[PDB]
From Swiss-Prot, chains A, B:
NCBIfam families: PRK05330.1. Residues 54-63, 263-299 are annotated as: Important for dimerization. This is Oxygen-dependent coproporphyrinogen-III oxidase. The lineage of its organism: Eukaryota, Fungi, Dikarya, Ascomycota, Saccharomycotina. Present with 22000 molecules/cell in log phase SD medium. Involved in the heme biosynthesis. Catalyzes the aerobic oxidative decarboxylation of propionate groups of rings A and B of coproporphyrinogen-III to yield the vinyl groups in protoporphyrinogen-IX. The keyword Oxidoreductase applies. GO terms for cellular component: cytoplasm; cytosol. The gene is HEM13. Optimum pH is 7.6. Its EC number is 1.3.3.3. Substrate binds at S114, N130, Y131, R132, G282, S283, R284, V285, E286, S287. Belongs to the aerobic coproporphyrinogen-III oxidase family. Pfam families: Coprogen_oxidas.
């Protein structure tokens, strides 16, 4: 096989996320002493499958996954209906006297990579990344509606200003190759999505985040997604390499653990992907909860000292600041 | 002071839970070496406020709280309709035509004690207790709609049949003094309420649970609540005394942590009183989340070995059993 671009967007996206899963896990393994372990599943011809890749109890990474998922399926105008509050262009209304509720169940294809990495060392940050694509099918399997979602974000317990700069800079650089407008909008969006309402703070220092993105020609968005993937390793590996061998106190371990409880609170209360996954009888519960860290802690009425490093993180989570340029 | 039985139910309930908060904390202190600390806040001329007694880093209890909350306020249909699901006599019907809906507001009072205790030792179980009262008001301040809710339940990581039997038995004995139908009914309800749907198991081995209970004269229900309260120290102190000094391993502590992860999943995804609290304005988040343990863990695809003591717990959380004479 030769001549890519010829190929259907759905198949182009699948191949990209499968290559990046391999490239990213290889990158991460290169700075640890343990391997990611693959497990594969199916719902054959019926509706797809995936490949989960998990690292545990490393010298560098305590727990992480890099999962790829592919879904061929049916979508009721009942459930279709609900996912319009978030997605413009989607169709089948059940109308005030028109619409087109062809009942039935419109076909859909979805695929994505979702990754969460949690280091051992308090000074080395948690990160998360997702790039995905979705489409409906016109009786003849071609894309009716479609969009991309994704982004990457960084979750320090100890704020290192260089690390936040590098991470946000390289994702800005990636999006600036396609449109200078996106970084500011997607950075903002990411400040907003990861807000833990009841804690009045974000879980970390954000990054970029977007969804329902269909504004340009899908072939162009694919290159955007690729360049965004390639912002990850050069920032994240660099960051981990310089934090992973810093010394840590039991108090710094405690603070990380507190910040890991915040992460859990976000993922179990606010995360849309998660809620949906856990609902849905027969879902892959272990896979959807691989985002949770190996350890977390909750302390009653805990408040860091003014001017402490722990309070310095809080300044930026309660009040989101700019990271570069 | 006058005959307390002559006071409004709201006042008698407030008094009972404030007494029980003191009696229960003193009881738990009697088998630790560390003290609970008290914090008390007020809602001024809105009424009332609350009192949390919390323990951290005891020799017997790693984390625990015994909390009392008294609220006076106005229900806007933001709940009078959104509470109706769980409350069958509630009352401000915005009618298809006739029945008198408000606009306007209904005044209410609510008060309750809520406690969660998490022992250091893997062999000593976590426990939870709550007794509460709610009423809307007539224009003259007398109760219109009212109910009690509560119960108590036990959450072992290592199953000891006799602990289950004593905990269930003393609570059955309490309820039997008032009515022998209530324990089967409330025992079953507890089996159902603490089911972690996505994990296909309950968090522990249950106990008793009720809500919306208004089936008798509230004065007799007050006395039922008191006897139920009184089932707690005689079961739980006896249980903890014979578990707290049991030897334990790292691996037993890991299982405890895994079970505590299940506890968190329940409290943050399924628990109604937690959801309510994180969503209500001027809610004391730290009070609401004090139920979460100091430490929890999540392991990917963890399954105890066939025949292990860990698997024996799972027998009983995946399929409830009976515990009583």
């Amino acid at each position: 096989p030769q001549d890519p671009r010829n190929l259907p967007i759905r198949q182009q996206m699948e191949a990209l996320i499968r290559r990046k899963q391999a490239e990213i896990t290889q990158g991460l393994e290169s700075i640890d002493t343990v391997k990611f372990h693959a497990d594969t599943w199916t719902r054959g011809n019926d509706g797809g499958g995936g490949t989960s890749m998990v690292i545990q109890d490393g010298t560098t990474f305590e727990k992480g996954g890099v999962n790829v998922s592919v879904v061929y399926g049916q979508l009721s105008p009942a459930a279709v209906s609900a996912m319009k509050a978030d997605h413009k262009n989607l169709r089948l209304p059940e109308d005030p006297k028109t619409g087109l509720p062809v009942t039935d169940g419109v076909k859909f294809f979805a695929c994505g990579l979702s990754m969460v990495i949690h280091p051992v060392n308090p000074h080395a940050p948690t990160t998360h990344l997702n790039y995905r694509y979705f489409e409906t099918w016109n009786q003849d399997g071609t894309p009716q509606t479609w969009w991309f979602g994704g982004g990457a974000d960084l979750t320090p317990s100890y704020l290192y200003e260089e690390d936040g700069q590098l991470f946000h800079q390289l994702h800005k650089d990636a999006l600036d190759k396609h449109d200078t407008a996106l970084y500011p909008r997607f950075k903002k969006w990411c400040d907003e999505y990861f807000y833990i309402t009841h804690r009045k703070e974000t879980r970390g220092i954000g990054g970029i985040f977007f969804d329902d993105y269909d504004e340009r020609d899908p072939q162009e968005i694919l290159k955007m997604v690729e360049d965004c993937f390639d912002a990850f390793l050069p920032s994240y590996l660099t960051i981990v390499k310089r934090r992973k061998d810093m010394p840590y106190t039991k108090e710094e371990q405690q603070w990380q653990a507190i910040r890991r409880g915040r992460y859990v609170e976000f993922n179990l209360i606010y995360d849309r992907g998660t809620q949906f996954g856990l609902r849905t009888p027969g879902s892959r519960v272990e896979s959807i909860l691989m985002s949770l860290p190996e350890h977390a802690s909750w302390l009653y009425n805990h408040h860091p000292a003014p001017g402490s490093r722990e309070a310095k993180l809080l300044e930026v989570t309660t009040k989101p600041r700019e990271w570069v340029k």
